[PDB]
Design a protein around this ligand. Structure first.
Ligand SMILES: NC(=O)c1ccc[n+]([C@@H]2O[C@H](COP(=O)([O-])OP(=O)(O)OC[C@H]3O[C@@H](n4cnc5c(N)ncnc54)[C@H](O)[C@@H]3O)[C@@H](O)[C@H]2O)c1
Ligand SMILES: NC(=O)c1ccc[n+]([C@@H]2O[C@H](COP(=O)([O-])OP(=O)(O)OC[C@H]3O[C@@H](n4cnc5c(N)ncnc54)[C@H](O)[C@@H]3O)[C@@H](O)[C@H]2O)c1
Ligand SMILES: NC(=O)c1ccc[n+]([C@@H]2O[C@H](COP(=O)([O-])OP(=O)(O)OC[C@H]3O[C@@H](n4cnc5c(N)ncnc54)[C@H](O)[C@@H]3O)[C@@H](O)[C@H]2O)c1
Ligand SMILES: NC(=O)c1ccc[n+]([C@@H]2O[C@H](COP(=O)([O-])OP(=O)(O)OC[C@H]3O[C@@H](n4cnc5c(N)ncnc54)[C@H](O)[C@@H]3O)[C@@H](O)[C@H]2O)c1
Ligand SMILES: NC(=O)c1ccc[n+]([C@@H]2O[C@H](COP(=O)([O-])OP(=O)(O)OC[C@H]3O[C@@H](n4cnc5c(N)ncnc54)[C@H](O)[C@@H]3O)[C@@H](O)[C@H]2O)c1
Ligand SMILES: NC(=O)c1ccc[n+]([C@@H]2O[C@H](COP(=O)([O-])OP(=O)(O)OC[C@H]3O[C@@H](n4cnc5c(N)ncnc54)[C@H](O)[C@@H]3O)[C@@H](O)[C@H]2O)c1
Lengths: 288, 289, 288, 289, 289, 288
């Protein structure tokens, strides 16, 4: 039944989702708002599939056939016969709302619509879609070709059938789909971001240096990255937005953002992407 | 310096601290309250040093010399000339208080006293010791011979000199000492335990199953253990006690224990050590069913 | 501006290109698909530099410093910061196309990409690269350490700046760069291969023996090798592929391969590398 | 006298023989029937010499010089001036016969011809060669670069001089040549294979499990591999073929193949190379329980 | 349930079985027919335990306690309350029969009787014992303190319970018990001895020298000893007796002893113990000439 | 303060000294006069570290890191920043003199120079170095990775500081440094070689056979090797050279070489390395 997958957004996540869908044997249409963004997206797909081929993880045939199953477009109308459309556009409720109203109008009636959103309520996006029973969260992990997890998020009205289809797509993509209810932060961000926020509060209070905090979590807890270097990697603007969703969604002070996180974002010290957050980065990323 | 190290408590942590001190070239006196506990402790040390020798991490000489530098005793008086005494007894403020009053009285004036406590304020233990400028937290990670971290916790009155001595001992033990202020949860537990507590709240609220929660944190965040299986490993009684220290010490509802964590502890479902917490364990401590 | 040169293919030509780049003072990253091929390539570089040292063409210092400037790698991503990348992989348009799509995606924007291709249109490879203004033919001659010529081939879109950079690299390598337009056979193969093909036709027609044909061209025209022994040296499969490129590219019967050349290739009589073409060879490649 | 060695067959054994000949300082011409087979052969030689280099058994120079002494060819005529030609082609008497008739015709008169055959009579191959006095068995052990033994097998007509030359080549290859007469199974297969066959019969009779049989021979007799896991390693088709040579060559029921060995081969349960014999193997050739 | 072990025969094997039983924590009564034999037996036990102590494989305490658990006796009646009695007397069916009839009469009803026999059918000895369900083969390997293997041999009537008890005793002795059915040669001798016999036949036929035969099996097959030097080590009289058991028990010419093996035994060339078999030995048992 | 160790001579001793320095955590530069000698040296280091790894005496990490700390070179100038340089070249005073004059000129002023010489006076080599207070004997035992002893030899002018640094390096190498004054034969050779020489004289005089002499010293005195088999192991040329240094240095006939030792050396019967001395050896160096 699922043969054709639409992906909206050829960014960090959408280009990975398009790749894993194509590698699984699905026909893929990847949509964005400018040719330059589509080109940047297929460049990321060629680099990733290229590494899989180089290290003997896939054959020449599978490499070339996967690329052959990806078509790019500037036109949402080219998703009219997709069985599943995965949205991976900017993390902005207004933008996703306008997209899902359009997708609800043009997608064939049996098409499932899915969001890769980190933080926006699945139930709200489901209402904007006009087909809430055929709406679900399909939350991938960065970078998509390397991360086995899909967090599958049921909206209030998500049907059993919708969940079964998306769980099977994840399995065909070589992923482990784990199901969660639509509450603020789902599981992934609800568990991760308050610990990062607590590290930032400990830093503000002078409990320890950034090096001591990151070293304690790496060496003591075997986290691959400490929370402050991880915040820099995610982006401090993204960290703040997720803490605000927890604070506003639970309505509980428990989830208040660190005032130092607010201050860093006001300063534009947004992490690796700005060349500076808690640490300073050179042009390649790497700390200095 | 420091030539002679006392370790009080030949348990899970103290037997590891004794081993790493001995392997570093320090003379060690390991003290407990019964011969059976000392025997269990040196059995753990022989098993660990045995594995290091077998895998070529140490020589026969270093293996034999390390064991040769460890003496056991039932008498605190045998610590009278220790340069550093590390306490690793039961996590109970009253017990540690009575021990530190005794150690303050009998240890030579220049001796530094240290606690491996997970949660009890270093500043309070420092006052009980009678020598707060020569008191410090020296917080090791389980299992001590394998975990490179020492969290070094300054009490209000801990001197620069005391910190310098203990940081150097940790380096000679092959550890990375990272310094933290004496506030509830230090860094390690303040960051870890509220995330475990949040996983337990998500489970109570029906947001996901225990398998989905642990799988998401393992696969998504590359945590070696998910928070619920980790809670079982630490002990749910220990998890609840640390959340209570954060709640009482910060005085902030932010750190309130999950009602499900309280209920599990009331039921005696304490994790691996009880054969059941979030998961069920066999006699070897592996999941079953 | 050019400090770092990538070479893809540690074969007959790529190992020579890597050597002359290293001897010229450039940092070299030499890439192939297996460690054994890289080892075989640096063994050829050590043998050649060893002969240059023995005959007093270079000093011990220059010998050791040249080897010191060559790193081998199985990862194309190690060419991310190369100023110039020269491709010397198998003569197959599909293989080169997939390589150049990958190189275009991973190389820094200012990097120039070049092909050592004998026959494949530079303008086509330039399109596959995604950066045609920064694409050029850089055609070396076998064996690269000994042959002074570089044939520099402008694609339709090759910039003046790209040509200037590659002409300067050739000069720093001690080579004479001579410029040609991207048309079938360039100059080198367009002039050489139809004369070899004509010798094969004269042989098929019974006009003379192979010895008479090669002797006439050696003694009469002062060619170092007659065309039939030269065909055996190049490989009859390579001769046929070049004649096919001339025939298909000009679309002109003038350039039709000799039916005897087709027949020899069907028989696997490919020349020196098969132990037999027009002549019979021993294991060392001498006539018997 | 021996400067130039021909090897026919760039397979498992021939590529090893070529390598050890080249490492010993001989010029080697390695012959096969297709370029792909020659490429596969020199790939195996580069991998092995690469490991010798990595472990400090040889220098970069000796590595490069050894490879420099190996030339490949599709033409038997290129063996016209070889002093010694060692055949390591398919174990098929007809194929070896056609090869040895050709080699006898083209090799210079003083050239010695040798077979690596496991089981075909040396005396018969010697007759096919047309120079039986200059024919001998030179039986190497898998893998050739690692195994010190050469079993040197005299045909009925093999001269003293032929034996002396081949014994000296084996010594220059760093091998221990041990001399045997041309009778079925020589020594190696005559002694080994009937014991493997007996283990298979004991298994068929229900005397013990495969694990008990292999464990008894490993622990009791200090054999590195038990006979059933060894049969799987050799290939049950090869084990059956060698038992048939003993049975037909001695003409004695003493050497009859186990009916269970026949049945396993009829089923295609050939051992490691088929993914299953007595034991089951994964793609890497390790057992799975 | 097994606390007390009887061993009958204080020879090469019985003194080893007594030692490993004592080292495992069992009370041991070691019986023979003369004081000199008992003295020779405990001398071998002191030498072996002495070497374990010197090399630090055991403590002084364990050394002294093991010797303390061994009593010697000339009276079978001293086995009246043994839980397990292991026979290790001369390899003679008549002698073992008379012993087992006596042991069946005097041993307490729940006592298990076991034979270390190399070759005599377990089922026959079981019948002589009068308690076949409580009879089993417990076949140790020379020298017992060093060899991990026990071959456990079920008689036709041996109970599951008897097998379970003897397998557990072997494990407490630090051994690996591997189970086999009572058929001629069990597994160990059925697999080993026909290959030794074949080496002797190849030698008689002039296929190769003794050095070539032993060298081929050492270097080619990674056997620690070649079959001819191994035959000398075992004793050629023992080799012939085991081949006779295979020949008579299977009733199959396949297992006929080599005529050269018979001739060597007729000449008294019995191997190391006679100073000459296939090889010549000095008084220390090293090859000479 | 000692971080970087130079070793000159990649022979039997120098390759062992380089290995033990690298295993102790020092950065090592190993120098010789030809590539083949450096290759033979690192082959011996790989074989030795390989055996330590195989028998579980070291970890994979320690094995790989030790090899990673060794660089080879044909240029003494690469020792310009060594803290300690240990010479282990040919036992020839003229060669060591020319080396130490060069090392004195190029090594940084605080660098200590040490000789592994068996027999040449430390005080003389110290004068050739131009920095006698920073010169010392550091005499290792064959084979270096297995032998715990370092004989530390004070020249007339060797400073306390120089001795302290070299004693500490020996301890970090896992060795037991024992201090001796610079007089002929130091302690090791002064005690050992006259007893070997006496065994040779007893053999020449027909007092006993070589087997009786070696058996008496093994069984009676618990020497692991008898003096004649030991002479074969050391090399009879080395034994003679050491006896000559005792004879010429003390100026005392007491230390005259056995005429049979001179005769054996004149015949080239040098011991294991020649396949024959007092005993005959196979290619593996076992008696025959
Ligand atoms: N980056 C992460 O690690 C990560 C992880 C999980 C989930 N997410 C979520 O995935 C989504 C995408 O994030 P990203 O990191 O890939 O962002 P990105 O900026 O890399 O990509 C966003 C893409 O969407 C395109 N786009 C914007 N508006 C559009 C519209 N109206 N129609 C079509 N295309 C439009 C942009 O041009 C761009 O190509 C967000 O909701 C984010 O919260 C991010
Ligand atoms: N984060 C954690 O996992 C955690 C939690 C709580 C406390 N701890 C800390 O770890 C250390 C001990 O924990 P463990 O897991 O090793 O425990 P354990 O119970 O295995 O060992 C403690 C040892 O102390 C001995 N002991 C008790 N009272 C004593 C006394 N008065 N004098 C001497 N010995 C005495 C006990 O007999 C026992 O051998 C303490 O410093 C404790 O504060 C660990
Ligand atoms: N050989 C000549 O005389 C000659 C003359 C001039 C031009 N050329 C051209 O140069 C090119 C190479 O020729 P050659 O003779 O060196 O061939 P070759 O077969 O010797 O070498 C090709 C190498 O490329 C490697 N390779 C293949 N695909 C690869 C990939 N994707 N990435 C990295 N390495 C890869 C192969 O493993 C091999 O080592 C061809 O385009 C040929 O037409 C050849
Ligand atoms: N593999 C072993 O363990 C082993 C042990 C000892 C002896 N042997 C014997 O060595 C010989 C080779 O065995 P292998 O395992 O190397 O086999 P293999 O199949 O790996 O190699 C045989 C090679 O011979 C080539 N070949 C076949 N017919 C040929 C012909 N007529 N002329 C030229 N080349 C020809 C094939 O192309 C192949 O490359 C056999 O006689 C075998 O019995 C094998
Ligand atoms: N020697 C081996 O390698 C070996 C291997 C395994 C099994 N076995 C078997 O073990 C048994 C013992 O062999 P061994 O090598 O110890 O022999 P042994 O001759 O060394 O010991 C036999 C002992 O039994 C005693 N003995 C004889 N008759 C007796 C009797 N009626 N009552 C009590 N004691 C008596 C003898 O006095 C002697 O002390 C034999 O059945 C033999 O086949 C021996
Ligand atoms: N071999 C022993 O058992 C032993 C014992 C202790 C001391 N020593 C002493 O150690 C020194 C080394 O002896 P060895 O056995 O290692 O000798 P070796 O011949 O094995 O090694 C000497 C190395 O020095 C190199 N060399 C020669 N001149 C050189 C120069 N000018 N610069 C750099 N390298 C140069 C040679 O090429 C060779 O690789 C001698 O002084 C010897 O007396 C030897």
């Amino acid at each position: 039944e699922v043969k054709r997958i639409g992906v909206v957004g050829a960014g960090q996540m959408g280009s990975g989702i398009a790749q894993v869908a194509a590698s699984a044997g699905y026909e893929v249409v990847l949509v964005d708002v400018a040719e330059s963004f589509l080109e940047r997206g297929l460049a990321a797909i060629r680099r990733s599939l290229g590494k899989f081929l180089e290290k003997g993880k896939i054959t020449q045939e599978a490499h070339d056939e996967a690329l052959g199953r990806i078509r790019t477009s500037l036109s949402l109308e080219d998703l009219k016969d997709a069985d599943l459309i995965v949205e991976a556009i900017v993390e902005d409720e207004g933008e996703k709302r306008r997209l899902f109203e359009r997708l609800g109008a043009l997608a064939k009636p049996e098409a499932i619509l899915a969001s890769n959103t980190s933080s926006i309520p699945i139930t709200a996006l489901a209402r904007y879609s006009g087909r809430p029973e055929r709406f679900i969260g399909m939350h991938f992990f960065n970078p998509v070709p390397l991360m086995q997890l899909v967090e599958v998020i049921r909206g209030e009205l998500t049907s059993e059938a919708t969940r079964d289809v998306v769980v099977e797509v994840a399995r065909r993509m070589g992923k482990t789909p784990l199901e969660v209810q639509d509450y603020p932060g789902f599981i992934s961000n609800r568990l991760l971001m308050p610990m990062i926020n607590e590290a930032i509060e400990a830093l503000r209070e002078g409990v320890a240096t950034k090096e001591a905090i990151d070293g304690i979590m790496r060496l003591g807890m075997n986290h691959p990255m400490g929370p402050l270097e991880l915040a820099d990697f995610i982006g401090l603007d993204t960290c703040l937005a997720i803490m605000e969703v927890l604070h506003r969604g639970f309505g509980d002070d428990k989830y208040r953002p660190s005032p130092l996180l607010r201050r860093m974002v006001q300063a534009g010290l947004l992490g690796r992407k700005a060349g500076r957050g808690f640490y300073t980065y050179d042009e390649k990323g790497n700390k200095v």
